[PDB]
Amino acid sequence: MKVISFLNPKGGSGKTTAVINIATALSRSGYNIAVVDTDPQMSLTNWSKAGKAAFDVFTAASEKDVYGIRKDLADYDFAIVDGAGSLSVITSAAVMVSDLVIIPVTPSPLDFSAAGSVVTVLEAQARKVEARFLITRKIEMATMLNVLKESIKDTGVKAFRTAITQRQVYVKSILDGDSVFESSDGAAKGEIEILTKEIVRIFE
Amino acid sequence: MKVISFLNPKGGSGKTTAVINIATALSRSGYNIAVVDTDPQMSLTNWSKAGKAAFDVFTAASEKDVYGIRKDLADYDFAIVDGAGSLSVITSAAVMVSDLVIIPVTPSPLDFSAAGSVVTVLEAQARKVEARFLITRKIEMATMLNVLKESIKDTGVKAFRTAITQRQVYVKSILDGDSVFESSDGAAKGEIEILTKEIVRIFE
Numbered sequence A, B: 001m002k003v004i005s006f007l008n009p010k011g012g013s014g015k016t017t018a019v020i021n022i023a024t025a026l027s028r029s030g031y032n033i034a035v036v037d038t039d040p041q042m043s044l045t046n047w048s049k050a051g052k053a054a055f056d057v058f059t060a061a062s063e064k065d066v067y068g069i070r071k072d073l074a075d076y077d078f079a080i081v082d083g084a085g086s087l088s089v090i091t092s093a094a095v096m097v098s099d100l101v102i103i104p105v106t107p108s109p110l111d112f113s114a115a116g117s118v119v120t121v122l123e124a125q126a127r128k129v130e131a132r133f134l135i136t137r138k139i140e141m142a143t144m145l146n147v148l149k150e151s152i153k154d155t156g157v158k159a160f161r162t163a164i165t166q167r168q169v170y171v172k173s174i175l176d177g178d179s180v181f182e183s184s185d186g187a188a189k190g191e192i193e194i195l196t197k198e199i200v201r202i203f204e
């Protein structure tokens, strides 16, 4: 029972949009996924209300839940946790039971200076728990992506080769009540799949 | 001493990017602005470290500050407050001393379902304190903007005629250490100015 947690307090990063599409992909590979929504506004949970999501959704009300992900969601292969926006007993909650931690970040000057808090929480664990960086909403602004890329290594943690581009299908898809794998955009699906491939590799 | 507060817990909305460019505009009209940074990571405060911002920056450490905006920043015409990401004693803090409240929102399916919490806090005030909605990062996805527009009125509060478009100059400009009024993009500046005109009108 491996646990993947997408953490990063700075909102408008990509956690939920990432969690949906990525787990959706993991489901399409035979894995019995179980996404846990912790956001106080159950954003992902609402989106799941529309149509039957490829994965099973669980709404955790308090830290007392994020901690049982091990004993409760034991029947599932993966247990993806959609972090909230506030570093309370939730960010440290995930890291404590998770087996892998993804930090979604945007190519912004200060939208990344909020991830560092997470990287520090991981330290407290080392048993050590795996962790990588996820470049989301990647816009093609050369000069800054480099700024992001650089400041990412100074954290010690590495980031997946692939980065989710800031495409339209990601916003529209969620609006409807489904992922991008429910569209005709091969590009969007592409990266998601190659990224999901990397995620599974991490467990080798 | 009129106070304008940009509130909205859901991050990645536009508060800081809005506060910079808008106050920057207010400064370019003779107004003695004073922006208050409350974000725990002082994002706007950092950006201000680069070059001399058109306005004066103040870093408030705790709720004990947001409350003195009246007695402290009395010499200034306007006192713009850049809200944080967590609805604690900060969101209710602003509304309690502010004279006008701007709620930045993005054309996302659930990135707006976080503003409502704010609208409820205003109720508690009614003396009543003015409030409007700000459409930021406006992307041209017809179908959803309408979804946003509609769900905005059901809140009772109206939104400025003008909406900040999701332009590149806004991200790059901040990266450098200045607003858009420090570029050659007439479009970006445009809306900001017309929006700033509306903001001042609210005080008639």
Ligand SMILES: Nc1ncnc2c1ncn2[C@@H]1O[C@H](COP(=O)(O)OP(=O)(O)CP(=O)(O)O)[C@@H](O)[C@H]1O
Pocket (backbone or CB within 6 Å): A010, A011, A012, A013, A014, A015, A016, A017, A018, A039, A043, A044, A082, A083, A084, A085, A136, A137, A138, A164, A165, A166, A167, A168, A170, A171, B011, B012, B106, B107, B108, B109, B111
């Ligand atoms: N890959 C992508 N391409 C384009 N837009 C994206 C995107 N990922 C996220 N967005 C947009 O960014 C905004 C916030 O994204 P998202 O909901 O993923 O953030 P979070 O802040 O991760 C959510 P939550 O707090 O519920 O976990 C929305 O307006 C969404 O449409």
Ligand SMILES: Nc1ncnc2c1ncn2[C@@H]1O[C@H](COP(=O)(O)OP(=O)(O)CP(=O)(O)O)[C@@H](O)[C@H]1O
Pocket (backbone or CB within 6 Å): A011, A012, A106, A107, A108, A109, A111, B010, B011, B012, B013, B014, B015, B016, B017, B018, B039, B043, B044, B082, B083, B084, B085, B136, B137, B138, B164, B165, B166, B167, B168, B170, B171
């Ligand atoms: N008008 C606009 N056009 C294009 N990108 C914008 C934008 N307004 C904001 N952004 C982008 O959105 C992200 C978050 O914006 P911003 O920092 O304004 O959010 P906040 O969440 O308002 C910040 P803070 O929490 O510090 O108050 C950044 O990656 C930024 O470049």
